[PDB]
Paper text:
Recombinant production and biophysical assessment of [name], [name] and [name] — To investigate the interplay between [name] and [name], we cloned a panel of seven peptidase constructs, which included the wild-type CD and the inactive E540A-variant, in which the glutamate acting as general base/acid for catalysis in most MPs (hereafter “catalytic glutamate”) was replaced with alanine. Subsequently, we obtained a high-resolution map at 2.8 Å with a 300-kV microscope, which enabled us to build a near-atomic structure of the NTD, CD, WD, and Oβ domains. No map density was observed beyond Oβ due to the intrinsic inter-domain flexibility of the sample (see Section 2.8). In a second step, atomic displacement parameters and alternate conformations were refined against the raw map to obtain unbiased statistics. This process was repeated iteratively until the final structure was obtained, which encompassed residues [name]–[name], three zinc ions, as well as one glycerol and seven azide molecules from the concentrator buffer, and 151 solvent molecules. A comparison of the CD + WD + Oβ moieties common to the MX and SPA structures reveals that they are essentially identical (core rmsd = 0.61 Å), except for the surface loop T480–S485, which we attribute to crystal packing. Moreover, we identified a glycerol molecule attached to the catalytic zinc instead of the formate of the crystal structure. The main difference in the structures lies in the presence of the NTD, which was defined at a slightly lower resolution than the adjacent CD + WD + Oβ core. The NTD is connected to the CD through an extended linker (S315–D324) (right), which is well-defined in the map. It contacts the CD on the right surface of its USD through a small surface spanning 424 Å2 (linker excluded), but not the WD and Oβ. Overall, this minimal interaction may explain why the NTD is not required for CD stability, and [name] constructs lacking the NTD are comparably active to those that include it.
The sole known peptidase capable of cleaving both [name] and [name] is [name], a unique enzyme encoded by [name] (formerly Clostridium ramosum). [name] is a ~ 140-kDa, seven-domain, membrane-bound metallopeptidase (MP). Differential scanning fluorimetry, small-angle X-ray scattering, AI-based structural predictions, mass spectrometry, and high-resolution crystallography and cryo-electron microscopy of multidomain fragments of [name] revealed a novel 313-residue catalytic domain (CD) from the igalysin family within the metzincin MP clan. The CD is flanked by an N-terminal globular C-type lectin-like domain and a wrapping domain (WD), followed by four all-β domains.
Numbering used by the authors: 32 to 876
The structure:
């Protein structure tokens, strides 16, 4: 038969200690029916003290785990034993500290013990569903960024089972997938609710026994929550062998078939799932080779001579770094060159690096202000082999450590290399510019020698020719680092490859490095000179004096404090700089666009997406913008949406809007210091048919207003090429907030489906923006680099960037790709209309 598993069902699956284990389905939940050992299978210790390795995995993150053991579940001796089929003496102990004698209290010694699953048959293991569950993480874990999700709180400690679950879902967590697991607090309380006093365990004698739970004490580094004989959830040090094991699995109901039994306590459902197909169960990671080979091509490479100051141990004394062109739309001189490098990527895992870079890069290019410049970035991935992965703790190429604050820092001290943080500017950068870059600037100085006048001066050229240095770490850890002191040569960011926020963190850190933007969450008064120094942060309360006064009232720009009472002020509560979920704010888009325009010579104007809003007069004057609370910001956003007649709200227009003023508004920045720009704005009510709407007397309902945008004199002072810092500049230079207000006539003829239509025209009549722009379709373009015969050029991994629909890409193709010479381009100067359009640059050899 195929059973139906109810709460209280008893199954007899597997054998431990030569007795089949009676499991009971305590709860039914989303993953499946939950089977819990009826009696504590054995009396063992969650995790022994640190014996073998203290520099890798859980025992590394706190040194008190030498004394007591580790409350990390993924590494635990319990997870390793419960989920092992291994023969005796061969259980992989994931943390690397086995449950050896003298590290588990008392007799202990469950190293040399066969895995729990070893005596089981393969079919019985198949019947346990491989489930991905949240496991709360302790402070050593959540300060080294070992967290799969957003949630910020420590679990509150309540001993009663009723109150034990408090804060669980809001608590720090990471997701672990396994067949056999010890119950967490939520699941123990579920067992309680469904099955009364069954949450108190009983051993073979029948005396009540404490049993371990996988929930750690989030405030503590070693302690583990456990269920005692009385029934109190409590904390025990994990090294002790007094406490019991009550393993639980999730039945895979569909394949499961019970050959015998009714599921009663006396007569359990005896069953397994034969036809279910699985690779042999191994929670253990596959073992890669000691000496890898490159997954990727080495045909195009840069070779670095790193002396003692850069590699004191000597493992990177002459690295060969393969180079991959993810994007080379134009020449390096004309474009912004981004160099991404790899941390904790072994030779065999370099393909992953390339794909990761592509992933992250493309996701970053979905964000504006980058999207406007997507085709202007030259993107290069440098394959920097690491002897070990980041999580293995072996020597990594860049020596990245994570400090106590979750900050990822290249450590000069770790291998005793004083100048490791200077590797990008002094070692990697000069070689890239000499070899890969079209400028081919020969290296004037020896990084290994000592410069004569300023130890930081000669390397200043690197940052001109390379816009950004990025480091991607082969980690699911969540951390971000931005290092932006050009005087001392530091222009680089460190970000993770597979964190839940990997692409968001990448975009954020890129915003520091290239755009120059600061963290909007940071708390602290900005004094006068520092206040001039910050592009996106101000401590000026008065709306009339604030830097972004012109942009106030545009889209979601209301000036608000980042945190309560704080003297630090931001243009929008929702920006990527404060919260990585949210997109870049208008001040950031403007300032980053201006910075990138300094880097590339084509752009002449910035037109923010115009918005048509009804003109109540709310938020129309500087006084209205005085309140600086976050609540007031959200009230402004509500009023804006209730007024908005543009974009997605283009259909909010109605027959009643006669006698009502409507306001078209944009912010326009003139990127040209030399010549001022006259831009015409046209706003007419549009019938669904498409003809301009009329009043009763037939006069068209349309408004025209010509705004002249001034020159950008302070251009030289705002992030010029060749600039160490933004010491002072004027926000308002070259910036005009253009507002056209139209009184819809009181006698106007309005029908259903009429919508406001606006063209922002230049002098020649080219339409810079229109009512379709905000909603306009973005179509993916893939750039490919091929030989004449159609064979793929090696060391090129073309990315995908989004261009607006109907965009005709007109970018002079780069004369040379590596030593290859450009013969033709396919797909340029043609409307891009399909997602997945491919532009193929053909080079010859
Ligand atoms: Zn351990
Ligand atoms: Zn930041
Ligand atoms: Zn912002």
């Amino acid at each position: 038969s195929k059973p139906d598993i109810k709460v209280g069902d008893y199954v007899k699956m597997g054998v431990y200690n030569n007795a089949s284990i009676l499991w009971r389905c305590v709860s039914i939940d989303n993953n499946g029916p939950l089977m819990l050992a009826d009696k504590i299978v054995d009396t063992l210790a969650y995790d022994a003290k640190t014996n073998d390795n203290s520099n890798s995995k859980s025992h590394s993150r706190s040194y008190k785990r030498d004394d007591y053991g580790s409350n990390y579940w993924k590494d635990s001796n319990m997870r390793s034993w419960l989920n092992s089929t291994a023969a005796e003496g061969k259980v992989d102990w994931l943390c690397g500290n086995p449950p050896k004698d003298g590290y588990v209290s008392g007799v202990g010694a469950y190293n040399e013990k066969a895995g729990f699953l070893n005596a089981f048959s393969k079919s019985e293991i198949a019947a346990m569903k491989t489930v991905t569950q949240r496991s709360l993480v302790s402070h050593p874990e959540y300060n080294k960024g070992i967290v799969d999700g957003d949630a910020n709180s420590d679990l509150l400690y309540y001993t009663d089972i009723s109150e034990a679950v408090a804060n669980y879902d809001s608590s720090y967590f990471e997701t672990t997938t396994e067949k056999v697991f010890l119950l967490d607090v939520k699941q123990a309380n579920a067992v309680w609710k469904n099955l009364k006093g069954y949450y108190v365990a009983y051993n073979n004698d029948g005396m009540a026994w404490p049993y371990w739970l996988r929930t750690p004490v989030t405030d503590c580094n070693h302690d583990m929550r456990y269920i005692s004989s009385s029934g109190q959830v409590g904390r025990y040090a994990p090294w002790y062998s007094d406490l019991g094991v009550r393993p639980a699995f999730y039945l895979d109901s569909e394949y499961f078939v019970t050959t015998s039994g009714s599921g009663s306590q006396s007569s359990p459902y005896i069953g397994s799932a034969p036809n279910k197909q699985e690779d042999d169960y191994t929670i253990s990671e596959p073992a890669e080779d000691a000496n890898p080979d490159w997954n990727v091509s080495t045909e195009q490479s840069i070779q670095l001579t790193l002396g003692p100051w850069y590699s004191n141990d000597g493992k990177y004394s002459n690295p060969t770094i393969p180079v991959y062109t993810i994007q080379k739309t134009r020449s390096d001189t004309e474009n912004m060159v981004v160099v991404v490098c790899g941390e904790g990527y072994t030779k065999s895992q370099q393909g992953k690096f390339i794909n990761d870079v592509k992933r992250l890069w493309q996701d970053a290019m979905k964000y504006e202000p980058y999207r406007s410049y997507a085709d202007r970035f030259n993107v290069y991935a440098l394959c920097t082999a690491s002897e070990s992965t980041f999580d293995n703790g072996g020597s990594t190429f860049f020596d990245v450590i994570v400090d106590k604050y979750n900050s990822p820092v290249i450590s000069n001290n770790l291998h005793g290399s004083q100048w490791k943080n200077h590797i990008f500017e002094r070692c990697i950068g000069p070689e890239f510019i000499e070899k890969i870059h079209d400028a081919h600037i020969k290296k004037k100085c020896d990084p290994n020698t000592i410069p004569s006048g300023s130890e930081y001066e000669p390397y200043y050229y690197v940052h001109d020719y390379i816009a950004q240095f990025a480091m991607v770490v082969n980690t699911k850890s969540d951390f971000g680092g931005a290092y932006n002191n050009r005087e001392y040569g530091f222009h680089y960011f460190i970000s993770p490859s597979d964190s839940y926020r990997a692409s968001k963190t990448f975009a954020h850190a890129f915003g520091h490095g290239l755009l120059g933007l600061g963290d909007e969450y940071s708390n602290g008064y900005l004094l006068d000179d520092k206040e001039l120094k910050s592009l996106n942060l101000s401590s000026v309360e008065d709306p009339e004096k604030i830097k972004w006064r012109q942009l106030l009232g545009f889209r979601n720009t209301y000036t608000c404090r980042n945190a309560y009472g704080s003297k630090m002020l931001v243009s929008s509560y929702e920006c990527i700089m404060r919260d990585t979920n949210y997109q870049f704010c208008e001040v950031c888009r403007l300032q980053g666009f201006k910075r990138m325009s300094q880097l590339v010579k084509d752009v002449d104007l910035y037109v923010a997406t115009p918005e048509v809003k009804e003109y109540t007069g709310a938020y129309s004057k500087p006084s209205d913008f005085t309140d600086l609370e976050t609540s007031s910001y959200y009230n402004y956003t509500y009023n804006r949406n209730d007024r908005l007649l543009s974009g997605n709200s283009k259909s909010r227009f109605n027959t009643n809007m006669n006698g009502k003023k409507i306001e078209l508004r944009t912010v326009i920045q003139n990127i040209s210091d030399k010549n001022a720009r006259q831009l015409k704005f046209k706003m007419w009510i549009k019938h669904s048919d498409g003809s301009v709407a009329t009043d009763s007397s037939g006069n068209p309902l349309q408004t025209v207003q010509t705004f002249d945008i001034p020159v950008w004199n302070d251009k030289a002072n705002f992030w010029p090429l060749g600039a160490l810092d933004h010491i002072k500049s004027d926000f308002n230079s070259g910036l005009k907030s253009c507002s056209l207000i139209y009184q819809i006539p009181s006698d106007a003829q309005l029908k259903s489906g009429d919508t406001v239509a606006f063209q922002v025209l230049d002098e020649n009549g080219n339409v810079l923006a229109d009512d379709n722009t905000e909603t306009q379709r973005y179509t993916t373009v893939s750039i490919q680099y091929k030989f004449e015969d159609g064979s793929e050029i090696p060391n090129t991994a073309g990315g995908t960037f989004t261009v607006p629909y109907g965009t005709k890409l007109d970018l002079t193709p780069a004369k040379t790709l590596y030593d290859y010479e450009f013969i033709k381009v396919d797909g340029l100067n043609k409307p891009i209309v399909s997602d997945g359009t491919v532009v193929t640059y053909y080079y010859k050899n």
